[PDB]
């Protein structure tokens, strides 16, 4: 019979698809996919995170940004920058007047990005569908805060188990991200104190429950 660490496991295959398809593909990394190869470690955090596998997938990503143009930077940097950069982008926060420009062919690029991150972002949160995003996390949490709850002791806040469910504006800095605070109390939790078997499960339908957010506010990855 299935378990919750062979539903980990099939969450981990899913997220390997992804990966082996960055180690197939190195092409063309517009900025949801960029954020796309980190969402696949970021996640697969919550199982165990391969150091080889991880460096020799943001290898392709580099790659791409070399291929495409020879830059100082490394996949550490990039993969923080570019979470910040999208959740800024998100927030369109106000700066002072400034100049400056780009190759044409560089700048139609950039254009062809922005416009692959609007493209799926509109049929997420425009096309007849953004109240999905408030619907999802409201029933979401509304169901398993009864079950975290009736299996007791509750192990979160009420809003730290909406906001596990959520797993909103993937780039948040780590000064604001409150999804992954929870996951790091969550991990530690489970490095640490007793928990049944049957808690633990719960703590699993709390990850596929935000999977299940993640894909209705992100969309797929690797699909097939």
Not at 16 to 26: C, G, N, Q, V
Not at 88 to 117: N, P, R
Not at 184 to 207: C, F, Q, T, Y
């Amino acid at each position: 019979v299935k378990t919750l660490d062979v539903l980990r496991g099939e969450l981990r295959g899913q997220r390997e698809a992804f990966l082996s398809e960055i180690i197939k593909s190195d092409g063309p990394f517009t900025i949801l996919q960029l954020v796309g190869y980190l969402r696949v470690v970021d996640t697969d955090l919550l199982l165990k995170v391969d150091s080889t596998k991880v460096d020799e997938a943001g290898k392709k990503v580099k790659a791409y940004l070399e291929k495409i143009g020879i830059r100082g930077d490394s996949v550490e940097a990039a993969l923080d920058n570019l979470m910040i950069k999208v959740y800024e982008i998100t927030k369109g926060t106000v700066e002072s007047s400034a100049q400056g420009t780009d190759s044409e062919e560089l700048k139609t690029l950039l254009l062809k990005f922005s416009e692959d991150l609007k493209a799926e972002q509109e049929l997420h949160s425009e096309a007849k569908g953004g109240e999905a995003l408030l619907s999802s996390m409201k029933t979401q949490h509304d169901e398993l805060l009864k079950k975290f709850a009736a299996l007791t002791p509750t192990f979160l806040t009420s809003e730290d188990i909406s906001g596990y469910l959520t797993v909103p504006e993937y780039g948040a800095p780590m000064n604001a991200a409150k999804w992954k605070k929870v996951e790091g109390m969550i991990h530690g939790k489970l490095e640490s104190s007793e928990v049944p078997a049957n808690l633990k499960a719960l703590v699993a339908e709390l990850i596929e429950l935000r999977e299940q957010m993640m894909d209705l506010l992100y969309g797929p990855i690797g699909h097939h």
